[PDB]
Design an enzyme around this catalytic site. Structure first.
Site: not given
Ligand SMILES: Cc1oc(Cn2ccc3ccc(Br)cc32)cc1C(=O)O
Ligand SMILES: Cc1oc(Cn2ccc3ccc(Br)cc32)cc1C(=O)O
Ligand SMILES: Cc1oc(Cn2ccc3ccc(Br)cc32)cc1C(=O)O
Ligand SMILES: Cc1oc(Cn2ccc3ccc(Br)cc32)cc1C(=O)O
Ligand SMILES: *Cc1c(COP(=O)(O)O)cnc(C)c1O
Ligand SMILES: *Cc1c(COP(=O)(O)O)cnc(C)c1O
Ligand SMILES: *Cc1c(COP(=O)(O)O)cnc(C)c1O
Ligand SMILES: *Cc1c(COP(=O)(O)O)cnc(C)c1O
Ligand code: NA
Ligand code: NA
Ligand code: NA
Ligand code: NA
Ligand code: NA
Ligand code: NA
Ligand code: NA
Ligand code: NA
Lengths: 380, 380, 380, 380
Positions: D47, D99, D171, D196
Site C-alpha cells: 500500500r 466531468y 485534469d 481512457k
C-alpha cells in the site's frame, strides 16, 4: 523439516532484489545484456528460462527431493517431453490402464515416430520383466491408476529399470509429492499434471517434471528449449501459490476420503469400491510401503447408468465436471465421459461398468460430503 | 474493410455474456456440465479449448484470411506441432537459412523420429523442384529469412507444393499478417512466433498457426490436444491486446526502416546492407509482389568485431537484447550471439561476418533512430 | 451447511455463460450496450461494477451472512469509505488501541473534514456509553486489537449503538468470517483488510465491506462509485482463490497457536503473553461467546530490545516482515516497526515494551513452529 | 529526445536485477527485511509502495515533466486524493462543465466535509479572478471539457493561481501528456483518468497524478498511504504497456479527427460541431498555444433523439459504450447516457440537445471511419 513446513519454505519463492515475499511475475520475453554474452542473472530469452518458471521448477525439484525441475504448458506436454528422450525404434513399457491422454499420445502420435509401446499389467512386476524387449529403453508407470486405482510397486519397478538399463518414469499426479516421492525410491524421472492437486484450484493447466539425474536433466532442458511446450509466467506464479496449501488440502481430502469410504462400503446401493486404502485392495501393502497417505480419487459401482445419473442429480456438493484435484468435490461417470470411445463390452470386461462412478474428493466439510453422498445414494 | 479497421474489429474479442469490450481472461481449467455430455458453450477442459485462447485463435485466423487458428506456448511449439503432421520416413524441404531454433528442432529432435530434412536455396524455386524426393511430404519456407533477409517466392512455392502433393507452410513471423498473407497465395499453413511483432511488447512467448484446410485443422487440433503445447489464457489475452496496435506499430517501423536504410547506404563505415526494400536485393520484385510492406529487421556490415562492439556501446536508443519485434529498437551481432556455434570460417562463407550487425527497428521517433545510429557510426 | 463447505460453495464463483468453475477475470473497463440504456447483464463501466469484483463481493457478503459486499483497493480504503458515511461535525467512538493506519487516517485526514473522534477503552462497554456525545453517529471497534489483543463485547456494542442511533462497525480482520460474524450479533457494517487472512498469500492489498442494511449499502455504493477506491479484477480474482482455503488455513493456524502459547507460557525467557485464548485474559469469556476460534496474532514479552533482536535472528521458520495472515509465520517488534513514532515512555505506559514480540502464526508444521521458537528462546 | 522516443525510453520500465525488458509484476503485499528497519530496496508494504506501481508512477512523472507520480485505483480516486489536500472551510474554483463524476464527488461527498465549490466559466480567466474568495485554496480546470470541448487558458490559470496562493490542478485526460503538459505552463498538479487514452485498451480503471512540487508530493503520498486508493500491480503493468503506444495511437486518432470533422461540417444532417481544432471555436488560439495536437472526442448536433438513435444503429465501426480513449471508436448520446439526470430544458439551455452525438475516435482506418459515419448520416 516436516512436510507442511517444507511446503512453505522449500524452493526459492521470494525476490532476492526487492525482498518481496512472493515470486514476481516476469511477464517478459527477453532480457538486457550489459555486454554481448554477459547475462545479468542468467536470463536471455524466456523460452529458454524465465525467473517465475524458475521459481516453480525449484519448488517441484525440492518437493520431490530432486535437483532439476521443468514446467510445461500441460501434463501431456511434460509427458511428451519425457517420451521425446527416445528415438525411432525404442520401446516403452507402461501400465495397462494409463491415463487416456497418455495412451492417445503414445498410440496416435509417437507411434508414428517409430516409438513402440506395450501396455502390461504392472501390478505384478514380473510382467514388466517379461515385457522387456532388446529395444526397451523406458518404463513408465502411474500409481495409483485411473479410474480403478491399481497400485504398482515403485521400488521394484526402479530396480528392474536399473538392472535392464531403462529410464524409469512415474506419473505421480494422483498422490502429489506430499504423499509419495518416486525419486526417493530409485526412479529416474517423476512427473505431474499440475492441473490437478498441485495447482489445486482448477485454474492452471500445467505439467511439472523433476529429476536428480544431471544428464537426463540436460536432455529434458534441451527438449524443452527446442520444442517449446513451456509454462507461462502467470501460470507458474499461480502454481507456486496453489502449492503453498497442498498439505492442508491433501490432509482435509484424506480425512474425507476415509469417512466417505466407510459410508460407501456400508451402503446397499454400492457394490465394489476401488481405493488403495481398502485393505482387500490389490497391492494395498505395497501402496502403504511407498506412500504415507492417499489420493482423493475414489471409484465405486452403483447398479447401472440410470442409477449413476440419479446419483449425480441428487447431490448438493458434488460438481459434474472433468479433471480432478479441485477445492470442489467432482463427480463423473467414466463410461459416459472419459471412456465412451471404448466399446461397451470391452468397458465391461475391464471393469468400467455403466454404473461406475468416480468422485474426486474436495475440501468441503467431511460430514457434509459423507451425508450428501449418502442421501443421494438413499434415493436409489 | 481496410487493414487498420480489420485489426480492431476482426475476430471475436468481446464478451457476448456481459458485453465487456475486451476478451475475459478465463484463468480456468474445467467447466460445469448441466448433463453428462452437454457443454454449455463447447468448453469442457482448458487444454482442449479455453475461451480466451479461442479469442486469440479467431484473431489470427481472421488476420490471415484462414478459417482455423491455433495458439501454442511458443513459436517453436507451433513449428513442432506442424512438423508432427508427418511420420517416420517423411521428408521436408526447408529454405537453407531457417531460424536457428527451427534448424535445431529438426536436426536434433525430429530427425531422431525418422523425419528427414533438406535445407536448400529456395530463392530459386527450381531448387525446390530438384530437392523433391519420393518421400517428400512438406515444404517449409521463411520469407524473408534471418539474418540476411533472403526472399522466397511464396506463390510459386504453393504451386510446386500443390502439384507434388506437399503440405506447404510459411513462417510469416518477420512480415506479420499486416503485410503478407501466405494463405491467400495458396499456402496450406501459416505460422508465427507471436513472441515478436504480433504481441509486440516483449512480454509474451507464444506461437500462432492458421489454416483454411479443414482436414489439416483437424489434425493440428488433435496434435495440440494430445501433446499439449497450448498457450495459457493470460498470454492469449496479452496477444489479443498487443495485436490491436500491430498496424500502427508496423507502419511506424516501416517509415523508420526506409530512413535508416538511406542513412546506412550513405555512411562510409557501412558496407553491404541486407533488406528486401533495397532494389538490388535478390527477389526484391518477388517480395514486392507478395507483400505490401517490409519487415523491421535490417542487417548491415561494419568492418569487424571491434567496430560492432563500439557501435553497440555508442548508441542511445538501441537496446542490446535477444528476440525482435519489440516497441524498443534492438541491436545484436549474430556471429557473437545467435551464430556463435558455427565455426567462424563457415560463418564467413555464409555471409555472417564478424562485423555483421542486425537491428530490429522499434517505434521510437524516426529521426532519433536515424541520428542516433548515424552518430554511433561516426565514432567508427 | 458447515463452514468448510460454505467456503467452497457460498457466493457466485463460476461463469454462468461458459460454465468455467472459477470466476473469469474481467480485465475490462466498459461494456457494449445493445440499445442506449439497456445493459446486457447490468454492467456499463467497471468503476461502478465489474463482474470479477462482483464475485468477490458476493463471497464476502455470503461469508458474513450479509446481503451486500464491497471490494476496495485496500483495508484503509474500505475504512475511509465507511468513515465517509459521516458529515462535518459528526463524532465517532473507537476502541483506544485501533490499528495505526485507522488512527492516522482519522486524526490526520478526516479530522480536517470536521469529523470528530474519541478513542476510549471499549473493553468496558459503559465507557462507550459515557463517551457518547449528542453528535456521535458511529461506533467503530476492532476485536481483538493489535498488538495486545484486547477483546470488546460485540453484541453489547451493537445494542448500545442501536439504542443511541449509531452506525456500528467492526473491523473483523483478525478473526476472519470463519470464526466471528459481527453482522449476526447486530452490527451494521463489518469490514476487513483482505490483505491479511482472507487473501492469505501476502499477494493482494484489498479491503472488503459487508452489510445487511439496504440503505447503508446504497450509501456505501454511492461513495465507492464517487471516490473510486475500487479493487481491480485481478486482485478480486486472487481474493476469491485465496478465500477458498481460509478454513483449512485458519484451523492449521489455530492448532499451532494453542501449542505455541503453551510453550511461551512455560518458557523462562518469556513474561506476559497476550492472546484471547488465555483464560486469565480480559474478556476471555466474551471472546469465547462471540467467536468459535482464535486469531493467529500472538504477542509476548522478552526482556529487552537486544533479546528481541536475538530471538528474531535465531529462528529458522519465522520471517521478519510487515503485515500478518501469510502462509509464512511472521515476526516483528512493534516498538521498532509499527510504534516507533510514539515516544518510548508512552510505549512503555501502554504495554508496548522494548521486548514485546508479535508473531503472526502461519501454516507451517505445528511442531516445527513450536520447536523453532523454543530453541530461539533458549538462546536468550 | 522527440516524443515517440521519450514514450519508449522515459521512466524506469526494466528490471535492474534480471534485466527483463518489461517491468515485473509484483503481485505481492509485503517485503523481507534483513534487519529491523533496513529495507533491501525501499519496499516494506505494498500500500505504501509497490515496485510495479513505482514503474508506472515514474512513467507519468517523466511524460508530464514532473518529479513525482502517483497511481490511484481510478481517475476519481486521484481527483479525490487531490481534493483531500484541503480542509473544511476551504474553497475550490472549477470550470463550469466539469466531468460528471467530478461534479458528483464534489457536490455530494466533499461538500459534506465543509469543502466549498463554485463552478464558473473559466473560458474567460477574469471569471476565475472574480470567483476568488478569501477562503479559496484550489483552482481545478479541465481543458478541453466534456462534451462541448470548451478550452481554458492553462498558463493564465497558473499565473492567477500563483498570484493568489492557489494550488492549480489540470485534469489533462482528454489531451494526454503527448499533446499538452500543464506542469510546463506553471500548473502545480496534473492528473488523468488513465482509464481512457493512457491505458488506451479499455481494460484498466486507473488514475495518475504528477507534480514537480516536493511538498505537494509529500502531502499526496501521505493521503495515498492513509486512505489507500492505490492502483494494483497488474493494472500498473497494463498501464505501462498501453502507454508504450500512446503516441502512435494519438497520431492515428488525430488524422482521423481532422478528416471526420471536414465530413461533419460538410454534411447537411449535421449542425454545430464542437472540437478545439475548428478555427471558429472559442479559445482555438489558446488551445493551439498550449497543445500541439487534439483530443479524439468530437461532439456534433443531429436533428433530434430519433436521428441520433438511427445514426448509432446505421454505423458499422462505431461502438455504443461508455468511456473514451479505446482502440475502438465509441459513440454515445449524452442526453440519454451521461446527462439524463439533468432536466431536459436545462440540458437544452446548456447545449446538450437531444440530438447531440459524442464520438471518441479510435484507431481504425481513417477512410473507413469517415465513410462509415457519412453513410450513416446519409440515412438521416
Ligand atoms: C480414456 C481412454 O483410456 C484408454 C486406455 N485404453 C486403450 C485401449 C483400451 C481398451 C479398453 C479400456 Br477400459 C481402456 C483402453 C484409452 C482411452 C481413449 O481416450 O482412447
Ligand atoms: C543460429 C543457427 O542457425 C543455424 C542454421 N545452420 C545450420 C548449419 C549452418 C552452418 C552455417 C550457418 Br551460417 C548456419 C547454419 C543453426 C543454428 C544453431 O543454433 O545451431
Ligand atoms: C502504530 C500507531 O498506533 C497508534 C495509536 N496511538 C495513538 C496515540 C498513541 C499513543 C501511544 C500508543 Br502505544 C499508541 C497510540 C498510532 C500509530 C501511528 O502510527 O501513529
Ligand atoms: C453528467 C453530469 O454533468 C454534471 C454537471 N452539472 C451540474 C449541474 C448541471 C446542470 C446542467 C448541466 Br448540462 C450539467 C450540470 C452533473 C452530472 C451528473 O451526473 O449529475
Ligand atoms: C525440512 C525442510 C527440508 C528438508 O526436507 P526433507 O524431507 O528432510 O528432505 C527442505 N527444505 C525446507 C525449507 C525444510 O523446512
Ligand atoms: C474489412 C473487414 C474484413 C474483411 O477483410 P479482407 O481483407 O477484405 O478479407 C473482415 N473483418 C472486419 C472486421 C473488417 O472490418
Ligand atoms: C451451508 C451453506 C450455507 C448456509 O450457511 P449458514 O452458516 O447456515 O448461514 C450457505 N451457502 C452454502 C453454499 C452452504 O453450503
Ligand atoms: C528525449 C528524452 C527525454 C527528454 O524529454 P523532454 O521533452 O526534452 O523533456 C527524456 N527521456 C527520454 C528517454 C528521452 O528520450
Ligand atoms: Na523458500
Ligand atoms: Na537416481
Ligand atoms: Na471483433
Ligand atoms: Na488452401
Ligand atoms: Na458457489
Ligand atoms: Na442489521
Ligand atoms: Na526507460
Ligand atoms: Na511548479
Amino acid at each position: 523439516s516436516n512436510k507442511k513446513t517444507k511446503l512453505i519454505h522449500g524452493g526459492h519463492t521470494t525476490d532476492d532484489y526487492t525482498g518481496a515475499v512472493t515470486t514476481p511475475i516476469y511477464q517478459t520475453s527477453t532480457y538486457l545484456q550489459d555486454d554481448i554474452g554477459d547475462l545479468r542473472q542468467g536470463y536471455e530469452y524466456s523460452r529458454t528460462a524465465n525467473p517465475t518458471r524458475s521459481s516453480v521448477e525449484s519448488v517441484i525439484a525440492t518437493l520431490e527431493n530432486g535437483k532439476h525441475g521443468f514446467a510445461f504448458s500441460s501434463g501431456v506436454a511434460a509427458i511428451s517431453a519425457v517420451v521425446m528422450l527416445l528415438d525411432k525404434g525404442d520401446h516403452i513399457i507402461l501400465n495397462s490402464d494409463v491415463y487416456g491422454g497418455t495412451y492417445r499420445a503414445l498410440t496416435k502420435v509417437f507411434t508414428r515416430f517409430g516409438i513402440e509401446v506395450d501396455f502390461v499389467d504392472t501390478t505384478h512386476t514380473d510382467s514388466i520383466v517379461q515385457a522387456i524387449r532388446p529395444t526397451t529403453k523406458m518404463l513408465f508407470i502411474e500409481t495409483p491408476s485411473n479410474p480403478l486405482l491399481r497400485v504398482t510397486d515403485i521400488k521394484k519397478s526402479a530396480e528392474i529399470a536399473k538392472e535392464h538399463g531403462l529410464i524409469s518414469v512415474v506419473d505421480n499426479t494422483f498422490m502429489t509429492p506430499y504423499y509419495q516421492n518416486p525419486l526417493d525410491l530409485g526412479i529416474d524421472i517423476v512427473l505431474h499434471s499440475a492441473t490437478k492437486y498441485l495447482g489445486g484450484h482448477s485454474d492452471v493447466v500445467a505439467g511439472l517434471v523433476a529429476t536428480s539425474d544431471d544428464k537426463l536433466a540436460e536432455r529434458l532442458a534441451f527438449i524443452s528449449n527446442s520444442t517449446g511446450g513451456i509454462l507461462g509466467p502467470q501460470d507458474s506464479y499461480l502454481l507456486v501459490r496453489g502449492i503453498k496449501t497442498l498439505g492442508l488440502r491433501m490432509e482435509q481430502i484424506n480425512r474425507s476420503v476415509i469417512e466417505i469410504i466407510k459410508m460407501l462400503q456400508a451402503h446397499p446401493a454400492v457394490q465394489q469400491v476401488f481405493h488403495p486404502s481398502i485393505e482387500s485392495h490389490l497391492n494395498h501393502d505395497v501402496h502403504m510401503a511407498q506412500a504415507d497417505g492417499h489420493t482423493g480419487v475414489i471409484a465405486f459401482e452403483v447398479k447401472n447408468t440410470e442409477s449413476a445419473k440419479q446419483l449425480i442429480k441428487a447431490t448438493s456438493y458434488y460438481t459434474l465436471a472433468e479433471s480432478l484435484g479441485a477445492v470442489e468435490s467432482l463427480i463423473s461417470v467414466p463410461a459416459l465421459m472419459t471412456h465412451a470411445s471404448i466399446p461397451a463390452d470391452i468397458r465391461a470386461k475391464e471393469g468400467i461398468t455403466d454404473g461406475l462412478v468416480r468422485i474426486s474428493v474436495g475440501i468441503e466439510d467431511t460430514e457434509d460430503l459423507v451425508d450428501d453422498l449418502k442421501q443421494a445414494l438413499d434415493t436409489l
